Design a protein around this ligand. Structure first.
Ligand SMILES: Nc1ncnc2c1ncn2[C@@H]1O[C@H](COP(=O)(O)OP(=O)(O)C(F)(F)P(=O)(O)O)[C@@H](O)[C@H]1O
Ligand SMILES: [Cl-]
Length: 444
């Protein structure tokens, strides 16, 4: 078992990872910016190293600084969390070249799945259902590009192969040329890569993703699914597991092909296969080769600690469970808590004056915040995650409502009130709302 790791992240997920390490007797190294000296996980850690000033580029994206910390503390591995460098192939590779364990997949695998064209080709090859598309990049020949639009059939969507998002719906030949030029130029200026591709556009899909784990002994398993349809500007607001309306037959179908994909591609560690789900059909869109924000819902309904499994896998230990031992039991819902303005949706940083966490049965609170903690302006608005579990969806929802009424966070503006409205929303209670629902309810 791993002796000592660098938690190369901050806020809630850093605390999340810290608790996993403590449980397993792993020593913790908290790397942090000068603005994060008083983070809960920093104050609990065994060793702390300050890697640079507030802005991410000189702290949480500073590759040399994070590797030095590892070297000077005698750490053996680096857990990158989500965001920051977690999907950075160059970083994972430098971690490996320097002789530390990247808690995550092989760099090569990260690079394969971080380009959408090559990711879709691999999934398609492994029998995972994808969206009909160009199946390869588009050149600058508009006669050919129109032929591809007709073959797919309108509406189509144009998409950068790298990845905020940068996409364009097209509904006829007239808008096609101009939508390609613009998408192309916006990917050149963003990821330096001007490659684009075309997919069939789905009007009312839901977002359903499959959690997987794969170890170094050939084992690969799926841990049911999550629905993260409730979104704003393509940012998830609420996630839940299992996904309403997914039968055990569908679960077993899409899960088995996700696991087979892992085997074919030599995947390792925790991963998420993201799908658009419409008319009872799954269509692949993206693989996240990392732990995700919304992993605690899958944990509540399976009993499997996903972070601890990451640490075990990275150490050479085989998965603690087989597929046959994974049972979906009950139902969990996650509400993201954001230090945000209720009318602008721009971050509202500031000093938390009073704080109270909810508690009780089936209630799990994932956050670093505390009374007197200042939320800095330099990072994401998500200060916390509230997860509620119940024997069925209706119980999970009802616990959420009460847990929210109890959550106290004074001194800054938060989305607690908005979450409460969504939990009271009669369509959410029916289940199965699409990815556009939250924006149509708010009028955005
Ligand atoms: N074929 C399609 N039809 C309709 N909508 C689509 C299609 N493909 C993508 N989308 C939209 O784009 C979103 C995903 O876009 P994209 O994957 O580029 O964002 P990303 O930021 O890369 C991410 F969210 F996936 P992640 O942060 O998980 O990587 C979906 O929520 C969906 O609304
Ligand atoms: Cl995420």
């Amino acid at each position: 078992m791993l002796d000592k790791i660098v938690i190369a992240n901050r806020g809630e997920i850093a605390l999340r990872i810290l608790r996993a390490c403590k449980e397993l007797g792993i020593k913790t190294v908290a790397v942090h910016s000068s603005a994060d000296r008083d983070l809960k996980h920093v104050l609990l850690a065994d060793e702390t190293v300050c890697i640079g000033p507030a802005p991410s580029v000189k702290s949480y994206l500073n590759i040399p600084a994070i590797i030095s910390a590892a070297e000077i503390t005698g750490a053996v591995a680096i857990h990158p969390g989500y965001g920051f460098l977690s999907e950075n192939a160059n970083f994972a590779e430098q971690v490996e070249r320097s002789g530390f364990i990247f808690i995550g997949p092989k760099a090569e695998t990260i690079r394969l799945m971080g380009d959408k064209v090559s990711a879709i080709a691999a999934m398609k090859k492994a029998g995972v259902p994808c969206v009909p598309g160009s199946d390869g990049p588009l050149g600058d020949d508009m006669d050919k590009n129109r032929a591809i639009a007709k073959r797919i059939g309108y509406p189509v969507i144009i998409k950068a192969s790298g990845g905020g998002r940068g996409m364009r719906v097209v509904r006829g030949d007239a808008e096609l040329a101009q939508s390609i030029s613009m998408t192309r130029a916006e990917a050149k200026a963003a990821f330096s890569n001007d490659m684009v591709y075309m997919e069939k556009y789905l009007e009312n899909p839901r977002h359903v993703e499959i959690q997987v784990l794969a170890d170094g002994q050939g084992n690969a398993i799926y841990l049911a699914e999550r629905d993260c349809s409730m979104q704003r500007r393509h940012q998830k607001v609420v996630e839940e597991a299992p996904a309403p309306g997914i039968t055990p037959e569908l679960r077993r179908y899409i899960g088995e092909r996700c696991a087979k994909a892992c085997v074919d591609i030599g995947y390792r560690g925790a991963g998420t296969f993201e799908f658009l789900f419409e008319n009872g059909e799954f269509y692949f869109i993206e693989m996240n080769t990392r732990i995700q924000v919304e992993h605690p819902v899958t944990e509540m309904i399976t009993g499997v600690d996903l972070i601890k499994e990451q640490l075990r896998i990275a150490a050479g230990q085989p998965l603690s469970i087989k597929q046959e031992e994974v049972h979906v039991r009950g139902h969990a819902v996650e509400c993201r808590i954001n230090a945000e303005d209720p009318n602008t949706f721009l971050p509202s940083p500031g000093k938390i004056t009073r704080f109270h966490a909810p508690g009780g049965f089936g209630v799990r609170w994932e956050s670093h915040i505390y009374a007197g903690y200042t939320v800095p302006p330099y990072y994401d608005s998500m200060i916390g995650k509230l997860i509620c579990y119940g024997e069925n969806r209706d119980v999970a929802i009802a616990r959420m409502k009460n847990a929210l009424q109890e959550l106290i966070i004074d001194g800054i503006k938060t989305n607690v009130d908005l979450q409460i409205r969504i939990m009271n929303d009669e369509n959410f209670q029916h289940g199965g709302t699409n990815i556009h629902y939250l924006e149509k309810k708010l009028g955005l």
